[PDB]
Design a protein around this ligand. Structure first.
Ligand SMILES: CCCCCCCCCCCCCCCCCC(=O)OC[C@H](COP(=O)([O-])OCC(O)COP(=O)([O-])OC[C@@H](COC(=O)CCCCCCCCCCCCCCCCC)OC(=O)CCCCCCCCCCCCCCCCC)OC(=O)CCCCCCCCCCCCCCCCC
Ligand code: BCL
Ligand code: BCL
Ligand code: BCL
Ligand code: BCL
Ligand SMILES: CC[C@H]1c2cc3[nH]c4c(c3C)C(=O)[C@H](C(=O)OC)c4c3nc(cc4[nH]c(cc(n2)[C@@H]1C)c(C(C)=O)c4C)[C@@H](C)[C@@H]3CCC(=O)OC/C=C(\C)CCC[C@@H](C)CCC[C@@H](C)CCCC(C)C
Ligand SMILES: CC[C@H]1c2cc3[nH]c4c(c3C)C(=O)[C@H](C(=O)OC)c4c3nc(cc4[nH]c(cc(n2)[C@@H]1C)c(C(C)=O)c4C)[C@@H](C)[C@@H]3CCC(=O)OC/C=C(\C)CCC[C@H](C)CCC[C@H](C)CCCC(C)C
Ligand SMILES: COC1=C(OC)C(=O)C(C/C=C(\C)CC/C=C(\C)CC/C=C(\C)CC/C=C(\C)CC/C=C(\C)CC/C=C(\C)CC/C=C(\C)CC/C=C(\C)CC/C=C(\C)CCC=C(C)C)=C(C)C1=O
Ligand SMILES: COC(C)(C)C/C=C/C(C)=C/C=C/C(C)=C/C=C/C(C)=C\C=C\C=C(C)\C=C\C=C(/C)CC/C=C(\C)CCC=C(C)C
Ligand SMILES: CCCCCCCCCCCC[N+](C)(C)[O-]
Ligand SMILES: CCCCCCCCCCCC[N+](C)(C)[O-]
Ligand SMILES: [Fe+2]
Ligand SMILES: [K+]
Lengths: 239, 301, 281
């Protein structure tokens, strides 16, 4: 029967497709490790796929995966139990150490580039032609933390030029320096910008950028991880 | 209340983005269209520019001829009465030739000939458009995934109005051009072939269709959940994994025991969707050509 | 075992109930209070299905079928072998799904991410509940719910649908289908676009988001953007399920005749109802 052959054949194909898809999704994070960082005994029935190489634009090089995996940063956590499967407690201030929900990845310390080789993200004041086209302009508004205290004021919006969208709000603190806050983590209101994730006293702790006119992938991760980390770790200060 | 990032809070705009050049013939790109602040609350506010070379002109012309051919037939059935056109809009239908004409083109215009003409225009419109998906990607140096995926949809479409009718020996087997009529055709097709719920390829097609909604709901929600870490900038998370991709992976590893990668999830995605019409086309093509009654077939299998 | 980058995220906290009592993992799986709840509900449900199988007289996966109480029982209880088991299993399923969603919420809290996933899952749960709880309650009997059998639930779909003629005529059903088809269309497009940029022509450099926007503007004159496409995929899938639940909740309740006849309201509009010509004249 032709139909029988077809369906039998399809299932064989599907099993092979699933095998392929699963191995493709093991190009990051594998081999699996024990909590101490050494290779785990059981890796599962799926083997690692042959390496593939991505050619990155603008001379940024290449990326080959799977490849030797390493955090490339200290992880300030310690075991809380004598066997595997339990939580690992922060050895210091989790927000400052960048662990738990305040984690950041050691991404390349260079800015993401658009298709023309220019910085993808730029403060609006430096992005020729860009301006707020709809909604409440947050620039000039005071910034309130979850402790209901004002931590600063919005002095600019950092925009994704290629995709034309707001990505960060640049906030100036009392000492005159500024910090970037992810747009996804702020609530723009009529008379202010509210930040549920952080209490006023934690804004100074937000990681700073090296250059005032650009932000690297590494810095974005530290900034985003720190702000998000506040949801769990600033809870005591949150009203 | 926490901002959910479903709608943007503030829109920004800069010089119209004219796009990448690569090997594209700029002479064929129009100017930018207007900007929609309405659209901008959800997606990009920019309209255009669009690329329209010769192939594109052919596709649009042919596509419109298809649409107009059906429309003129509709007005005809409406007695050219505007009021009737609107009240019976969903009842009008441009039907294929009767079984008696087989696969010939000797059927009167009002009795199948016009259906063949509209179908010819549609055939040119779709295939030339497929050529467009391939060439626009080529001109930009991109992979041909879109054109390959589009082929899967084309497969079901081809089986329904071309391949199956030809194998069955008559155009009468094809789908009519009408809102309610193509639905009646669908119900009748299942009834006549012993209930499609018994066609294993129909069941698989359903699994993938439901699977597509499950997966896009999962993926869309995941990306939005990690957009606070730049998660939607997928190409760069692929080239340089960030905490967004790691948290997304762990949410699922911790939930269901396994996960994907920023690039891999898009492979699960393209296949989940593509298999909908791939299995579907096979299921329909075998109907009436190899299997007359799925219930019966299932009894012996 | 852990993914190479996993340990830094395995910290204490985020649980909604029990504090640190169930704050741990079993292999890759996070547990938590709701992980234990889900296991409890699921285990019981599966055990009750096996028992239903014994009362049915079969162990075959494609034959096992747990049916709800016959209509005569209305919304009351029923003997285990006559619909009661279905009733208990349904409670277990609901408990397992809701617990699964809440466990996802605890996982979101520990990871510091948005709650979009469990929120989206809640739509699927609500669709299930429309069919086994809301619709049956509104109609006056558990018997209107579908049976738990691989093939028998399809019999229910076919029978229920033809009870109203060709179910294609349900307007809410038409909208739901439109969202399902559009979603799959969008999923294929999204997967193909990202992949076409990440895996360009042989020897070339990875394309960028700019190239993705350019490809679609060149093709159809519009690109929704990377944030937008994920918002769209989510909206399309949830909308499809919302209209599915809606198309069924109104069937057998506010509308119970042949769906095709519903369309009479438009054709019978005073200003053209009697005008000669057309299909309806
Ligand atoms: C009867 C049915 C008739 C129906 C006809 C409709 C056809 C619709 C086809 C849709 C295909 C969608 C594929 C998605 C995709 O990734 O496309 C891009 C992919 C790469 O595009 P590119 O631009 O050339 O490359 C960019 C980068 O260089 C490279 O980019 P890349 O890395 O992304 O691409 C590499 C790609 C390489 O692509 C391929 O190798 C082609 C895959 C084609 C699949 C076609 C499906 C056939 C379904 C058969 C069902 C049988 C039932 C009967 O890898 C794969 O996708 C692998 C596919 C997994 C196959 C698993 C097979 C398991 C077999 C079972 C083994 C037994 C073990 C179990 C025990 O496309 C192709 O390679 C061409 C496909 C052309 C098919 C033509 C069919 C003729 C009509
Ligand atoms: C929504 C409209 C109808 C309906 C209409 C149809 C139609 C029409 C079809 C199915 C089909 C299926 N349905 Mg149904 N189905 C309904 C409600 C359900 C429910 C429920 C709790 O709500 C479940 C679990 C299922 C499950 C299933 C799968 C067995 C099968 C593949 C679908 C799929 O992959 O989707 C996408 C989901 C995934 C890819 C995730 C993986 C899901 C796995 C496949 C489901 C396991 C189900 C399992 C056997 C239940 C036992 C588990 C316990 C341990 C006992 N249906 C409602 C009542 N269903 C198809 C089939 O072939 O059926 C024979 C089919 O054609
Ligand atoms: C009473 C009716 C029968 C039945 C009869 C059929 C028939 C007959 C068919 C299906 C098919 C399908 N059925 Mg069924 N089906 C039944 C009940 C169900 C149930 C359910 C809960 O009961 C479900 C979930 C499904 C689900 C499905 C889908 C998996 C599948 C369609 C795939 C798709 O999206 O193609 C979407 C894609 C296309 C149609 C591709 C063509 C698109 C073209 C290429 C693009 C046109 C461009 C154009 C020129 C321009 C347009 C204008 C512009 C938009 C402006 N059926 C009952 C039992 N079903 C199809 C299939 O594959 O079956 C195996 C099919 O043929
Ligand atoms: C394999 C599936 C069956 C079928 C079964 C159904 C069912 C069942 C329904 C539709 C519905 C629709 N069908 Mg159909 N439909 C078929 C083939 C087609 C073809 C074609 C060239 O093949 C076209 C252009 C259409 C077009 C349409 C649209 C008018 C409408 C919305 C679909 C959608 O959301 O698109 C999204 C895509 C873009 C926006 C682009 N159908 C085949 C024969 N179709 C729905 C409706 O409202 O009908 C009145 C509906 O309920
Ligand atoms: C002859 C049959 C009638 C018909 C009768 C009906 C009836 C009756 C119904 C539909 C419903 C639907 N129909 Mg119809 N339908 C017909 C023809 C069609 C056609 C077509 C091409 O012709 C299409 C595309 C559709 C499409 C649809 C969808 C809009 C909808 C199903 C999806 C849904 O609601 O999911 C909702 C999602 C769920 C129910 C899933 C819930 C999942 C739960 C929360 C989790 C499961 C967990 C699991 C148990 C764990 C498994 C174990 C793990 C895998 C380890 N119908 C014909 C005309 N249709 C259904 C609807 O709208 O339902 C609300 C419905 O009831
Ligand atoms: C917007 C709606 C769409 C959607 C979204 C969605 N689904 C989701 C999620 C989201 C966002 C998850 O986060 C969650 C997930 O973890 O995915 C991997 C999930 C999920 N969607 C699933 C299935 C599923 N989703 C479906 C549909 C959809 N999901 C929609 C299209 C369908 C169908 C039929 O279309 C199915 C089958 C599960 C794989 C998973 C949730 C897993 C879960 O809740 O596990 C807890 C329970 C158990 C392991 C045991 C249950 C045992 C018994 C207590 C009950 C079973 C009895 C009876 C109900 C079964 C009858 C079966 C017969 C009908 C054959
Ligand atoms: C894998 C199957 C799914 C799929 C995929 C799909 N559709 C596609 C593509 C892909 C990958 C394209 O590249 C192509 C496109 O250009 O999208 C923007 C297209 C497309 N799918 C379309 C429609 C469409 N797709 C549908 C379905 C599906 N498409 C499936 C769910 C449906 C239905 C009935 O559900 C419809 C109505 C067109 C808008 C577009 C192809 C345009 C075209 O052929 O125009 C020719 C003529 C004119 C100028 C029109 C007059
Ligand atoms: C960019 O980002 C993203 C990721 O990362 C980079 C991702 O991975 C994903 C996730 C997606 C995938 C990996 C693709 C494949 C997934 C699907 C096609 C969807 C359908 C899913 C399934 C078939 C799997 C279902 C399996 C389940 C639900 C697990 C159930 C099994 C168990 C053994 C555990 C049971 C129970 C409990 C109660 C937990 C507690 C445990 C104990 C007490 C012991 C997405 C969406 C994503 O967008
Ligand atoms: C003019 O009037 C004004 C208002 C402007 C406009 C009015 C127009 C209106 C109201 C138009 C409405 C059109 C509608 C409702 C179209 C609906 C189509 C539907 C519902 C379904 C389509 C299914 C069609 C399929 C599956 C078609 C498949 C076709 C093919 C595979 C091609 C077949 C080709 C053939 C037979 C020709 C042979 C080809 C060669 C190579 C010579
Ligand atoms: C419907 C089929 C989709 C399910 C595919 C399931 C793949 C299971 C992968 C397990 C891999 C586990 N791990 C951590 C060891 O790699
Ligand atoms: C790539 C996603 C893998 C999805 C695999 C889907 C499995 C669902 C199978 C149910 C179809 C059953 N059958 C025989 C009746 O067709
Ligand atoms: Fe994506
Ligand atoms: K500016």
């Amino acid at each position: 029967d032709l139909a029988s052959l077809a369906i039998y054949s399809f299932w064989i194909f599907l099993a092979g497709l699933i095998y392929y898809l699963q191995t493709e999704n093991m190009r990051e994070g594998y081999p699996l490790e024990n909590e101490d960082g050494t290779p785990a005994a059981n890796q599962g029935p799926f083997p690692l796929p042959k390496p593939k190489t991505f050619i990155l634009p603008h001379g940024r090089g290449t990326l080959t995966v799977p490849g030797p995996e390493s955090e490339d940063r200290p992880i300030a956590l310690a075991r809380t139990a004598v066997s595997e499967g339990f939580p690992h407690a922060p050895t210091g201030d989790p927000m400052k150490d960048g662990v738990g929900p305040a984690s950041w990845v050691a991404r390349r310390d260079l800015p993401e580039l658009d298709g023309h080789g220019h910085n993808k993200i730029k403060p609006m004041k430096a992005a020729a032609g860009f301006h707020v086209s709809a909604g409440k302009n947050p620039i000039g508004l005071p910034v309130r933390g979850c402790d209901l205290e004002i931590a600063g004021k919005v002095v600019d919006i950092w925009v994704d030029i290629p995709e034309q969208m707001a990505r960060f709000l640049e906030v100036e603190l009392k000492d005159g320096s500024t910090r970037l806050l992810p747009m996804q983590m702020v609530k723009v209101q009529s008379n202010r910008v509210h930040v549920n994730a952080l209490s006023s006293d934690l804004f100074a702790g937000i990681p700073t950028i090296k250059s005032p006119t650009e932000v690297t992938l590494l810095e974005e991760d530290k900034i985003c991880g720190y702000v998000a980390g506040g949801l769990m770790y600033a809870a005591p200060k949150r009203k | 209340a926490e901002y959910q990032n479903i709608f943007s809070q503030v829109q920004v705009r800069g010089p119209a983005d004219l796009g990448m050049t690569e090997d594209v013939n700029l002479a064929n790109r129009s100017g930018v269209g207007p900007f929609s602040t309405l659209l901008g609350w959800f997606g990009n506010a920019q309209l255009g520019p669009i690329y329209l070379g010769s192939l594109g002109v052919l596709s649009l012309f042919s596509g419109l001829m298809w649409f107009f051919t059906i429309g003129i037939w509709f007005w005809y059935q409406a007695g050219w009465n505007p009021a009737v056109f609107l009240r019976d809009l969903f009842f009008f239908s441009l039907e294929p030739p009767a079984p008696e004409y087989g696969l010939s083109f000797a059927a009167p215009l009002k009795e199948g000939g016009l259906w063949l003409i509209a179908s010819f225009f549609m055939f040119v419109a779709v295939w030339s458009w497929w050529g467009r998906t391939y060439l626009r990607a080529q001109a930009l140096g991109m992979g041909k995934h879109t054109a390959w995926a589009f082929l899967s949809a084309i497969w079901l479409w081809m089986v329904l109005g071309f391949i199956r009718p030809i194998l069955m020996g008559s155009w009468s087997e094809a789908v009519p051009y009408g809102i309610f009529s193509h639905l009646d055709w669908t119900n009748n097709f299942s009834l006549v072939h012993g209930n499609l719920f018994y066609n294993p390829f129909h069941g698989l097609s359903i699994a993938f269709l439901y699977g597509s909604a499950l997966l896009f709901a999962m993926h869309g929600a995941t990306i939005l959940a990690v957009s606070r870490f730049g998660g939607e900038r997928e190409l760069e998370q692929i080239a340089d994994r960030g905490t967004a991709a790691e948290r997304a992976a762990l949410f699922w590893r911790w939930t269901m025991g396994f996960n994907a990668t920023m690039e891999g999830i898009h492979r699960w995605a393209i296949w989940m969707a593509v298999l909908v019409t791939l299995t579907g086309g096979i299921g329909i093509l075998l109907s009436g050509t190899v299997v007359d009654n799925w219930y019966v077939w299932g009894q012996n299998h | 075992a852990l993914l190479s980058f996993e340990r830094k995220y395995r910290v204490p906290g985020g649980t909604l109930v029990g504090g640190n009592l169930f704050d741990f993992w079993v292999g890759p799986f996070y547990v938590g209070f709701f992980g234990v709840a889900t296991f409890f509900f699921a285990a019981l449900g599966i055990i009750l299905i096996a028992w239903s199988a014994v009362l049915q007289g079969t162990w075959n996966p494609q034959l096992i079928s747990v049916y709800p109480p016959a209509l005569e029982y209305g919304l009351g209880g029923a003997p285990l072998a006559k619909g009661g088991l279905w009733q208990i299993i349904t409670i277990c399923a609901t408990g397992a799904f809701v617990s699964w969603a809440l466990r996802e919420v605890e996982i979101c809290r520990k990871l510091g991410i948005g709650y979009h996933i469990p929120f989206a899952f809640a739509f699927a749960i609500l669709a299930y509940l429309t069919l086994v709880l809301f619709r049956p309650v509104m109609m006056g009997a558990w018997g209107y719910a579908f049976p738990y059998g691989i093939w028998t639930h399809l019999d229910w779909v076919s029978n229920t649908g033809y009870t109203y003629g060709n179910f294609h005529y349900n307007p809410a059903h038409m909208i739901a289908i439109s969202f399902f088809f559009t979603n799959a269309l969008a999923l294929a497009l999204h997967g193909a676009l990202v992949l076409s940029a990440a895996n360009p022509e042989k020897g070339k450099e990875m394309r960028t988001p700019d190239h993705e926007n350019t490809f679609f503007r060149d093709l159809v004159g519009y690109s929704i953007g990377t944030l937008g496409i994920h918002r769209l995929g989510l909206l399309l899938s949830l909308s499809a399920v919302f209209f599915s639940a809606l198309c069924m909740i109104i069937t057998g309740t506010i509308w119970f005749d042949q769906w095709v006849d519903w369309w009479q309201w438009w054709v019978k509009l005073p200003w053209w109802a009697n005008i000669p010509g057309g299909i309806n004249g």
